[PDB]
C-alpha cells in the first residue's frame, strides 16, 4: 500500500464517487473522534474511517489523562491554575518555537471541554498526576483531566468495537471483567457522542490509501473496505488523525527516529505512516520525524516491549554496570537519556537491577505485565543469589556492578542520591509507597535473589509528521495551505518539539487541533 495521490480527472476516466460527506475523518483516536464530534454536532455529515477492526488505536490503550488546562473541569475541582499559568509552563519549556500553536492549544482547551461535556455521553474529572519539568507554571499535582469510568452497557454495540487494554490486546483477548477506564472510556464515550449526533457514519476495516486532488485542492480520498476500493467525496475537508510512523521500521530508519517499530506500544500493524505519506504525496511538508514520545520498555520474550512507568525501586546500569540517569525521571526524559548515553549499545539495552522486595516483581508498572517466570524462561530477565553471579549471567562487569549497588545502597541509607538526585522531585515521589527509610524513591537493594531486566527505547507513538497551522491545515514547504486537508495527533508535527511537558499532552493537542480543524471546515 503506497499513498500516491489520485487526480480527479484521471479517475473520471473510469470510476466515480462511491459516497459523499462534508467531513471525512481518517483514524478513530481521541483527536479523530473529537474532530468527528465537532463536525457532526454542528450539522456536517461525517464519515470516520478506522483501518483495523477496532476503534481507538493507541488512544484506547492510554490512561486517558488529557492536558486541557483552565477549563470548567478544573474550576469544579477548585484548582489553583489558569490558561495563563499553563501558557507560562509551555513558554518556559518550548520557547517562541510554535508559540502560535501553544497559544491556540491553551486558549481553545476550555471550548473543547465545554462542547464535549454538553453531550450526555461525556464527562471528565481532574485526576492528580504531576507535570514533568521544573519550570514556572508547573503543577506539582498536575492539571490533567480523565473521562469517567464507563459501564460498557451504556453504549450498546460500540463496546465490542473498542480496542482493549494492552494486557488483553497483545494476548488475543477482549475487555477484562470490570468497567471501561482510561482510553477504553475515552473512546467509548467519544464513539457514543459521535453516534448521538445522527450525522456520522463509523466504519471499521476501512483504510485510507490515496487522497484525491482536483486543481491542487483535496476533494476526497479512496478507502479500501473488504477487497473493494471506494471513492469518498469530502465537500469541506479530510481530517487525517491516523497516528504516526511508529509501526513502520522503514520510515523510522529513513527519518533517524531512535527506537524500533517492534518496541513501539502502538497497536501492532496499525500506525504505518499511511496518512503522513498520503499528505506528502499531495505536497505536505514534514518536521520532527526523528522525534517520538519516548519511554523505557521492558524487553519481552517475543522481542517487543512493555511501557515501564512509575518506577519505585531498583536502579539502572549501562553495559559497563554503572548508573547514568535518575531512574525515576518522567518516561520521555528517561528515554531521551538512554539515547543520549548510547555508545553503539552501551545504553540500549540498559539493565534494571532489583531484589525480592516485591516477591520477584520488577518495581514499576509494566504495560503489559508479563509474568517474571516467563521473562526468566526466555532470558529477558536473569536471577541469581549474588550480584557476582548476576553480573556473570548478564555479561556486566562484576566489580563495577557491585560498587554501583553498594553506592546506591549508601544513598538509600542516607536518603539522598549525590550522583543523580533521585527522589528530589514530586514526579519521582508520586509512585512510591512509604518505605521505613528517609527517601521513598531510594530503597537499598539487598534482599535476595537479585534480578536484571533488559530495558530498551520504547515509544508511545512518534510525534513528527505533517506541518500544520493553528487550524490543523496541512502546509507545503512554502507555508501555503493545501485546501481541504487537515491533520492532528501524531499525523501532524507536535508543537511540543523535543519536550513531553506533562501527562495528557499527546491526547490534549490531538483533541484541540481536531476541534479547530472541524471549526475551520464549518466556515
Ligand X SMILES: Cc1cc2nc3c(=O)[nH]c(=O)nc-3n(C[C@H](O)[C@H](O)[C@H](O)COP(=O)(O)OP(=O)(O)OC[C@H]3O[C@@H](n4cnc5c(N)ncnc54)[C@H](O)[C@@H]3O)c2cc1C
Ligand Y SMILES: C[C@]12C=CC(=O)C=C1CC[C@@H]1[C@@H]2CC[C@]2(C)C(=O)CC[C@@H]12
**Is there binding between residue 59 and ligand X (CB under 6 A)?**
yes
**Is there binding between residue 274 and ligand X (CB under 6 A)?**
yes
Residue 435 interacting partner from ligand Y, ligand X, none (CB closer than 5 to 8 Å by kind):
none
Phi (first) and psi of residue 449, to 5 degrees: -65, 160
Beta strands in 417-492 (DSSP E): 450-462, 465-466, 473-475, 481-487
Query: What residue has cell string 520477584?
Result: 360
Cell digits of residue 174: 477482549
**Is there binding between residue 296 and ligand Y (CB under 6 A)?**
no
**Residue 326, annotated as binding a ligand:** no
Total number of residues shown for the chain: 523
Among 129, 132, 133, 263, binds ligand Y (CB under 6 A): 129
Letters for 186-215 (x = contact with ligand X by CB under 6 A, - = none) are: ---------------------xx-------
> Do 495 and 94 form a contact (C-beta atoms < 8 A)?
yes
**In angstroms, what is the minimal distance from the CB of 489 to ligand Y?**
13
Contacting ligand X within 379-418 (CB under 6 A)? none
User: b/e per residue, 213-234, with b = 16+ CB within 10 A?
Assistant: beeeebbbbbbbeeeeebbbbb
Phi (first) and psi of residue 214, to 5 degrees: -120, 120
**Is there binding between residue 181 and ligand X (CB under 6 A)?**
no
Contacting ligand Y within 63-102 (CB under 6 A)? 63, 65
User: b/e per residue, 123-148, with b = 16+ CB within 10 A?
Assistant: ebebbebbbbbeeebbbebbbbbbbe
Among 24, 47, 49, 456, binds ligand X (CB under 6 A): 49
**Residue 28, annotated as binding a ligand:** no
Contacting ligand Y within 354-383 (CB under 6 A)? 365
Among 21, 24, 39, 64, binds ligand X (CB under 6 A): 64
**In angstroms, what is the minimal distance from the CB of 290 to ligand Y?**
20
**In angstroms, what is the minimal distance from the CB of 72 to ligand X?**
20
DSSP for 79-135, written as a single string: -S--HHHHHHHHHHHHTTTTHHHHHHHHHHHHHHHHHHHHSTT--EEE-----SS-S
**In angstroms, what is the minimal distance from the CB of 510 to ligand Y?**
11
Cell digits of residue 177: 471483567
Nearer to ligand X, 101 or 323 (CB): 101
DSSP 470: T
**What count of other Cβ atoms lies within 10 Å of the Cβ of residue 196?**
16
Nearer to ligand X, 208 or 387 (CB): 208
Contacting ligand Y within 418-447 (CB under 6 A)? none
**In angstroms, what is the minimal distance from the CB of 258 to ligand Y?**
19
Which helix (DSSP H) or strand (DSSP E) does residue 211 occupy? strand 207-214
Among 58, 286, 443, 519, binds ligand X (CB under 6 A): 58
Among 307, 420, 431, 486, binds ligand X (CB under 6 A): 307
Residue 270 interacting partner from ligand Y, ligand X, none (CB closer than 5 to 8 Å by kind):
ligand X
Q: Which stretch binds ligand X (CB under 6 A): 46-54, 326-334, 390-398, 473-481?
A: 46-54
> Do 441 and 426 form a contact (C-beta atoms < 8 A)?
no
**What count of other Cβ atoms lies within 10 Å of the Cβ of residue 446?**
14
**Residue 85, annotated as binding a ligand:** no
Report how far residue 476's alpha carbon sits from residue 486's, in angstroms, rounded to the nearest whole number: 12
**Residue 32, annotated as binding a ligand:** no
**Residue 9, annotated as binding a ligand:** no
Nearer to ligand Y, 63 or 110 (CB): 63
Among 45, 51, 185, 317, binds ligand X (CB under 6 A): 51
Residue 365 interacting partner from ligand Y, ligand X, none (CB closer than 5 to 8 Å by kind):
ligand Y
Using alpha carbons, select from 361, 333, 318, 381 the residue that is nearest to residue 447. 361
Report how far residue 4's alpha carbon sits from residue 247's, in angstroms, rounded to the nearest whole number: 19
How far the first Cα of the chain sits from its last, in Å, is: 34
Spatial CB neighbours of 220, under 8 Å, sequence gap ≥ 6:
17, 24, 211, 212, 231, 232, 233, 234, 238
**Is there binding between residue 34 and ligand X (CB under 6 A)?**
no
Residue 135 interacting partner from ligand X, ligand Y, none (CB closer than 5 to 8 Å by kind):
none
Residue 188 interacting partner from ligand Y, ligand X, none (CB closer than 5 to 8 Å by kind):
none
Contacting ligand Y within 302-331 (CB under 6 A)? 309
Cell digits of residue 251: 520510515
**In angstroms, what is the minimal distance from the CB of 63 to ligand X?**
4
**Residue 103, annotated as binding a ligand:** no
**Residue 65, annotated as binding a ligand:** yes
**Residue 58, annotated as binding a ligand:** yes
Cell digits of residue 377: 524462561
Among 108, 503, 520, 521, binds ligand Y (CB under 6 A): 503
Spatial CB neighbours of 470, under 8 Å, sequence gap ≥ 6:
100, 101, 103, 104, 516
Extract the annotated binding site for FAD: 50, 58-59, 63-65, 208, 271, 274, 460, 490, 507
Residue numbers at the binding site for ligand X (CB under 6 A): 26-31, 49-52, 57-59, 61-65, 166, 207-208, 241-243, 265-266, 270-271, 274-275, 293, 307, 367, 460-461, 489-490, 503-507, 510
Residue numbers at the binding site for ligand Y (CB under 6 A): 63, 65, 129, 182, 309, 365, 503-504, 506
Amino acid at each position: 500500500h503506497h499513498h500516491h495521490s489520485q487526480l480527479e480527472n484521471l479517475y473520471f476516466q473510469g470510476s466515480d464517487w462511491t459516497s459523499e460527506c462534508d467531513v471525512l475523518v481518517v483514524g478513530s483516536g481521541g483527536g479523530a473522534l473529537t474532530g468527528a464530534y465537532t463536525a457532526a454536532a454542528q450539522g456536517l455529515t461525517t464519515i470516520v474511517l478506522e483501518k483495523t477492526d477496532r476503534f481507538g488505536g493507541t488512544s484506547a490503550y492510554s490512561g486517558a489523562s488529557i492536558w486541557l488546562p483552565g477549563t470548567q473541569v478544573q474550576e469544579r475541582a477548585g484548582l489553583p491554575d489558569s490558561t495563563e499559568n499553563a501558557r507560562t509552563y509551555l513558554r518556559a519549556l518550548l520557547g517562541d518555537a510554535e508559540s502560535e500553536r501553544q497559544d491556540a492549544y491553551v486558549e481553545t482547551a476550555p471550548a473543547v471541554v465545554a462542547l464535549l461535556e454538553q453531550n450526555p455521553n461525556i464527562e471528565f474529572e481532574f485526576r492528580a498526576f504531576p507535570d514533568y519539568y521544573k519550570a514556572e507554571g508547573r503543577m506539582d499535582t498536575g492539571r490533567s483531566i480523565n473521562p469517567l469510568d464507563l459501564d460498557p452497557a451504556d453504549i450498546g454495540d460500540l463496546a465490542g468495537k473498542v480496542r482493549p487494554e494492552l494486557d488483553q490486546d497483545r494476548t488475543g483477548q477482549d475487555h477484562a471483567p470490570g468497567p471501561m477506564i482510561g482510553g477504553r472510556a475515552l473512546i467509548g464515550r467519544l464513539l457514543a457522542a459521535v453516534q448521538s449526533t445522527g450525522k456520522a457514519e463509523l466504519r471499521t476495516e476501512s483504510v485510507l490509501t490515496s487522497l484525491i486532488v482536483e486543481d491542487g485542492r483535496v476533494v476526497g480520498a479512496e478507502v479500501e473496505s473488504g477487497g473493494e476500493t471506494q471513492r469518498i467525496k469530502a465537500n469541506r475537508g479530510v481530517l487525517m488523525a491516523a497516528g504516526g510512523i511508529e509501526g513502520n521500521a522503514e520510515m523510522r530508519e529513513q527519518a533517524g527516529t531512535p527506537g524500533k517499530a517492534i518496541w513501539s506500544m502502538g497497536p501492532f500493524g496499525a500506525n504505518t505512516g499511511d496518512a503522513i505519506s498520503a499528505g506528502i504525496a499531495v505536497g505536505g511538508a514534514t518536521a520532527l520525524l526523528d522525534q517520538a514520545w519516548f519511554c523505557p520498555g521492558v524487553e519481552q520474550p517475543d522481542g517487543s516491549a512493555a511501557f515501564m512507568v512509575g518506577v519505585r525501586g531498583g536502579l539502572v546500569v549501562d553495559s559497563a554496570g554503572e548508573r547514568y540517569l535518575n531512574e525515576s525521571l518522567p518516561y520521555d526524559q528517561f528515554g531521551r537519556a538512554m539515547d543520549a548515553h548510547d555508545d553503539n549499545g552501551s545504553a540500549v539495552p540498559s539493565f534494571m537491577i532489583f531484589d525480592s522486595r516485591e516477591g520477584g516483581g520488577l518495581p514499576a508498572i509494566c504495560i503489559p505485565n508479563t509474568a517474571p517466570a516467563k521473562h526468566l524462561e526466555a532470558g529477558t530477565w536473569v536471577g541469581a543469589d549474588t550480584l557476582e553471579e548476576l553480573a556473570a549471567k548478564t555479561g556486566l562487569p562484576a566489580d563495577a556492578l557491585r560498587s554501583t549497588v553498594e553506592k546506591f545502597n549508601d544513598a538509600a541509607k542516607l536518603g539522598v542520591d549525590e550522583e543523580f538526585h533521585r527522589g528530589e522531585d514530586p514526579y519521582d515521589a508520586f509512585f512510591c509507597p512509604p518505605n521505613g527509610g528517609a527517601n521513598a524513591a531510594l530503597t537499598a537493594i539487598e534482599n535476595g535473589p537479585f534480578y536484571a531486566a533488559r530495558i530498551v527505547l520504547s515509544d508511545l507513538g512518534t510525534k513528527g509528521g505533517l506541518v500544520t497551522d493553528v487550524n490543523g491545515r496541512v502546509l507545503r514547504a512554502d507555508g501555503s495551505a493545501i485546501d481541504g486537508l487537515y491533520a492532528a495527533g501524531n499525523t501532524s508535527a507536535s508543537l511540543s518539539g523535543r519536550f513531553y511537558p506533562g501527562p495528557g499532552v499527546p491526547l490534549g493537542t490531538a483533541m484541540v487541533f481536531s476541534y479547530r480543524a472541524a471549526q475551520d471546515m464549518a466556515k
